[PDB]
Amino acid sequence: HGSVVDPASRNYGCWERWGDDFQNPAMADEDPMCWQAWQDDPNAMWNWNGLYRNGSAGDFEAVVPDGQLCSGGRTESGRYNSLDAVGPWQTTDVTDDFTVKLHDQASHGADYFLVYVTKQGFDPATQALTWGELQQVARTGSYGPSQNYEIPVSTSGLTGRHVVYTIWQASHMDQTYFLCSDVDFG
Template identity: 25%
Template sequence: MRRKIVTGLTALGLSCITLFATGGSASSHGQTTAPVSRQQLCYQHTVRNCGQIQWEPWSVEGQKGFPTRGPADGHLCSGGIGRFGELDNMRGGAWPATSLRSGQSYDFVWRLDTPHATSKFHYYITRDGWDPTAPLTRAALEPAPFLTVQYGGRMPTRSTIHPGTIPAGKSGRHLILAVWDVYDTANAFYACSDVQLG
């Protein structure tokens, strides 16, 4: 009887080790910190009632190929991951927003907990007249990225900075969608940042 209990506990222990080795934050990667992303705001507890994303803001990983592929409309900020759906909740346009000026130079910053060989980073902004209370769709974004940084398989640093320019001629509340395409997998990381353009 004692031998059966020990064997059972050993098997249970191995199962737990396997579970922790293959799931959870072992797949963590990165998020934008400037302009501050929704997942970073949740992680810092600046925004409450965020669900699971507050514990793993670096894990918003979905299919790459945006805008032709990738997460479905309405699920862009969560990367299409159901447990991070709070990121897609527009909260009536009440997410805290970074104050910026259209046309200004700006350093876009990613914090990469686990850097990967990278194809590119690309940044999109909402069109004039978009509805900040409606779920984010491709139609709400300008069709072309305003900034693309090609890596060609190179490895970015843990603190990755992309100098760019905020698109000119825009004002009011907008949203920036940043996408990080991994080079050697089918995935990308997504981050939404709310901005107020003066």
């Protein structure tokens, strides 16, 4: 089990930035999206590696409804539902070419990764994520077991605030992780 650690996924980022200080009274002001997530279910952050579905059989649109992409279709008994909130999620700056880095506690391997980015013109701070607002930026082949996976992504013509959506199909069984990372291309 794991997540995208760079550019940090929504819940990994909330954990990394606030986990040592998760009731900090400045969070509501400085990072309202993390604040509402911590208020809804702190375990969305403590269990940062648990954002998966089993048994999708590759049919992700059938199991991840529009507006529920960042929670993996309200997966894991709703633990990550707050990640579907619409608002000014904290971004990580990226260059046009950037590496998606995943950390995997179990070295499952990947059958493949799919990486999408929100289209130019889509505003993640005011619009719910939908499949129709994504553009595919990479698909990979398989990765052998490792504690870290790196996907070298290359984009051009993307500016400002976007969401990267990384889908990790693990190799040990039909299990899939759905990772939203807010990014800023500048």
